[PDB]
Amino acid sequence: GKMLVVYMTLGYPNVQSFKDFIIGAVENGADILELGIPPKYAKYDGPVIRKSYDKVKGLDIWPLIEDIRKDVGVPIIALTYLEDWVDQLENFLNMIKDVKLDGILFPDLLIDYIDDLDKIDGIIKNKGLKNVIFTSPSVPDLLIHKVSKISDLFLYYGVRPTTGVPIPVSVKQLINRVRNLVENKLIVGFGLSSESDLRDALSAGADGIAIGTVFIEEIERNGVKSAINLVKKFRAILDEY
Ligand SMILES: [Cl-]
């Protein structure tokens, strides 16, 4: 079947409500968790991700990661910029394995560290960790093909960002043009998540979808239990395929 990947900003909105959402999300069918590590600097994050980072400013991040690791048994991927840890890439990857997370996803890996790709994949893989590689429409087709054969768990393909203007092309067509390039499992991630966009990706052959900002929005406007119920809804939609 199809994989439901659920993102949440570590500690958002508060520590107790964050664990409630994660546990509820996993109970309602999340297959993979992505946890957003608040960034040491500003980068390619949109308005609603940034505001989620604002509300957990100064969070003690490692005890919470440890804590949530004890609470749920699904694969957990750390979402953080290779930027914030390239100075210290060794004590980061050891800490990640120390607290028992399954892998990482560096969004800026293929952008700002493309020449370091093969070294960094090698080190991650020889720590037993998963290197989940981020791609997007601006990643050239042959690079996408390259990383599709090395990406662990799945290759991630991000469309519909909250920042900027979306590509005025149907998600069905966008995924049609990468599905045959990706030998891996293909997870399509969304900033804006219309149901039409999600069904377009699944019907175009994506092996799952990743969603996150939709949950941050639903929490702020209707609360954690409402956001948990959205997970149930997305699970049912993926279960139609
Ligand atoms: Cl797009």
Swiss-Prot record:
GO molecular function: tryptophan synthase activity
PROSITE patterns (UniProt xref): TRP_SYNTHASE_ALPHA (PS00167)
Disulfide partners: none
Catalytic activities: (1S,2R)-1-C-(indol-3-yl)glycerol 3-phosphate + L-serine = D-glyceraldehyde 3-phosphate + L-tryptophan + H2O
Cellular component terms per the entry's GO annotation: cytosol
Coiled-coil parts of chain: none
An individual GO BP term: L-tryptophan biosynthetic process
Pathway: Amino-acid biosynthesis; L-tryptophan biosynthesis; L-tryptophan from chorismate: step 5/5
EC assignment: 4.2.1.20
Keywords, in A-Z order: Amino-acid biosynthesis, Aromatic amino acid biosynthesis, Lyase, Tryptophan biosynthesis
Active site: E34, D45
SUPFAM superfamilies for this protein: Ribulose-phoshate binding barrel
Purpose: The alpha subunit is responsible for the aldol cleavage of indoleglycerol phosphate to indole and glyceraldehyde 3-phosphate.
Quaternary structure and interacting proteins, as annotated: Tetramer of two alpha and two beta chains.
Protein family: Belongs to the TrpA family.
NCBIfam families: PRK13125.1
Protein name, per record: Tryptophan synthase alpha chain
Phylogenetic placement of the source organism: Archaea, Thermoproteota, Thermoprotei, Sulfolobales, Sulfolobaceae
Gene transcribed to yield this protein: trpA
